Each structure stands twice: as C-alpha cells, then as structure tokens.
Design a binder for this molecule. Sequence first.
Ligand SMILES: [Ca+2]
Ligand SMILES: [Ca+2]
Ligand SMILES: [Ca+2]
Ligand SMILES: [Ca+2]
Lengths: 152, 153
Amino acid sequence: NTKYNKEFLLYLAGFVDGDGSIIAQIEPNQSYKFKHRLKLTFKVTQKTQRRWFLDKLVDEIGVGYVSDSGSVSNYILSEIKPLHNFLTQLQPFLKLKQKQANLVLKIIEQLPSAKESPDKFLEVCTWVDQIAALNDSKTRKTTSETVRAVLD
Amino acid sequence: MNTKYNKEFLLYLAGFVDGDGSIIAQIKPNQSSKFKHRLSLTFQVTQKTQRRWFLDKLVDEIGVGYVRDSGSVSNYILSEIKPLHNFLTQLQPFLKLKQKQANLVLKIIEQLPSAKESPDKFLEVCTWVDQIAALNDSKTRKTTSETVRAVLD
DNA sequence: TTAGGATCCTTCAAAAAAGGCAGA
DNA sequence: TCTGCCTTTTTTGAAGGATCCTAA
Ligand SMILES: [Ca+2]
Ligand SMILES: [Ca+2]
Ligand SMILES: [Ca+2]
Ligand SMILES: [Ca+2]
C-alpha cells in the first residue's frame, strides 16, 4: 500500500478521465465454479510514440506494466490488491470515471463472498453490467444475463 | 483583469487536457488580411455530447469560451487572445504532454503586435506555428509557413 | 480452480486541422 | 482589416471490450 502525493493524484485523475478506462468483464470459462470468471482492469492508452509517459506511470504508480500493440501502447493494472489500493486513492479526484472506480472497489470487496454463492456471483455480475453502462460500451458480449444461465 | 484560477482545478484540468484536449495554432489564408493570412490560436477540449455538461462547466470555471456541437461530439473552444494567454500561463506549469505547445502559443501571442508589421517577423512567427503542429499528432494540415513564404510575390 | 497475463479486435470519441460569416 | 464566433472534415489514438494460456 503506497500512499500517493495529492498533486500527482489530481493530475492523474484528469488524465485518466481523458485517456483512461476502468473495465470490468465476465469471461466464460468452464473450469471456473460458475462457468465464468470476473476480470477487472485499469488501463491508460497512448500512441506508442508517447509510451515514455506510460513507462513513467509504471514507476510513479509503482505497480502495473506497459504493453505495446504496435500503433498504441497501454498501461495496465489488473492485480486485485494493488488495483484496490490504487483506485481507493484515485477515486476522490475522478469526475467522469468515479462511479466506475467505486463499483470496481465494491466488486473487489465482494469477491470472496461471490466465490461461494451463485446468487452472490450473479449480483456482482450486475455491478459489472453497471460499469459497462457507465462506459462507452460498444462490443460487449457476456453480461449478467448470460451468466443467469446458471439456471441449471 | 486576468482571472485567477485555482490550483486543484488547474492540476486536474492539466491532466484532462493532456488527455482529451488540443492546443492548436493555424495559419488561415485570407486575402483581406495584411499578409494574406490570419493567425488563429485555439485551446480545445473534445467530448462525446452525452458529456457536454462537463464542457459547459469549463465555460463557467474558465469564465470565457464556448461549447459547440458537431456530429456526435462537442468541443469547448477558447480562442480569444488575452484570456487564452492568461489561462495557458496558469495551466502550463502542470502540463506534461502539451506544455511545449502551450508555451509556443504564449510566445506567439506575445509577438502578434510586431508580427503585424514586418513580413519577416510574420514568417518567423509562422515557423512557431509549424513547431506546434509538429508537436501535435498533425494529419490534415494544409497551410504552413512555406505556404506563407509566398509573400515572395 | 483461480488469477494474472498475452494477444488481438471493434468502433468510435477524440484531436487537429480545414473553412466561413458579419459587425466594428 | 480585424477578430471573435461559427461549422465541417479527416484520420486516427484511443477506449472498451473479446479470448486463449498457464503457473500457482
Ligand atoms: Ca476521453
Ligand atoms: Ca454508456
Ligand atoms: Ca489523448
Ligand atoms: Ca507530431
């Protein structure tokens, strides 16, 4: 649990509200208890020419990594505990993505509980729906309703 | 007077501008201006129109400028020279990606009065416009300092 | 089984220009 | 002439997913 400087968080919140994404996904997979897994991602995208900015972000946040897809690169943070700490500190300063951040926090806090109960897993999937609705979602496939086929 | 902007607003806004903003300098052909071209300087923030309220708030906070809709997106735009200069002066220290463009815009604005008085000074200021376009992800630019250099006629 | 990572696609939502008009 | 508003176009640079892999 790093603590960040306020001036860094203020600037970063603005940058994330611009070029960032707070992403929650339900991924079908037969080896998981409820035939699906939850994936939570904080991402910041930038033309690879400016990957240096993302590399600096790695250093400054102190966790995560940068992946180059050719034309653009992405800073990525997915590991649950660091993501929780980071978003806890970022969230107060967000204006466009605040609600997404807080839903990701609520999801993370319920994960242990969602592992034990299909009712509970479903409910957490509905919060994933809400995050997608808050985002500019356009290619989504798997939703809580797909899962609700734990009806069975 | 020049509006004084608050620190936490400038810090957040600097991040947001490095994200979705644009600092733009243009040379616009126009036969009714002294050297057949007008310099135009713009600070712009783009956002999908469902989030226009965020751009509308910028008009309130910055206290000048306007919002325009186009297709599915809207833009906050500030091009009025004196307020733009005051705003970018205060924003520039917190910029990380667009700091150089901000500082070039400030330099150009400072030189406008004497740009309007010699071909060679006008040309030089135009090369500063070239430098901003280079720093930006320029892709549709037409009129450059070389276009101007047709003051040669 | 579970979590994190790898690799890629889909579709814009931005960016960064290009222009034009009409009053003072 | 000037300047400050207006209005469109072009081409991405982002966003926001999708899905396979494998060590733990
Ligand atoms: Ca954005
Ligand atoms: Ca939406
Ligand atoms: Ca950007
Ligand atoms: Ca460039």
